[PDB]
Amino acid sequence: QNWATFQQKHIINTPIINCNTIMDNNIYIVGGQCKRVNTFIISSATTVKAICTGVINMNVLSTTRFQLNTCTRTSITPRPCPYSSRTETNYICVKCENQYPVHFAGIGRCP
Numbered sequence: 442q443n444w445a446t447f448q449q450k451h452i453i454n455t456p457i458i459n460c461n462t463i464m465d466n467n468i469y470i471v472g473g474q475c476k477r478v479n480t481f482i483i484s485s486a487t488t489v490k491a492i493c494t495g496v497i498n499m500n501v502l503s504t505t506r507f508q509l510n511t512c513t514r515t516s517i518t519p520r521p522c523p524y525s526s527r528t529e530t531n532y533i534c535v536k537c538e539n540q541y542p543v544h545f546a547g548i549g550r551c552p
Contacts, residue, residue, distance in 0.1 A: 449466075452486045475522035477513075482510070484531070488507065489507060493540070493542035499537045
């Protein structure tokens with residue numbers, strides 16, 4: 442991956458109720474129709490860069506709360522995929538390469 446394209450990876454800081462117009466790009470689609478969970482994170486990419494600071498390859502997890510903005514593919518009002526936006530505490534597991542979060546490990550619970 443890269444720091445610029447990853448800038449979108451964790452920092453899709455869009456305070457609007459339109460998760461499609463913000464993710465309108467070939468970098469946000471799977472092999473079917475739309476993604477089941479377009480989880481975005483609302484926070485400065487550098488604060489996330491501090492929690493992933495350790496070595497040139499590791500696994501860390503934001504235990505405090507990096508406030509996430511998740512648009513989950515639910516149902517009703519298909520356009521064609523309906524999304525329910527909900528913001529809350531972000532306890533997630535990030536991965537660090539080159540010391541910057543180059544990959545997302547997934548949810549908070551990590552090994």
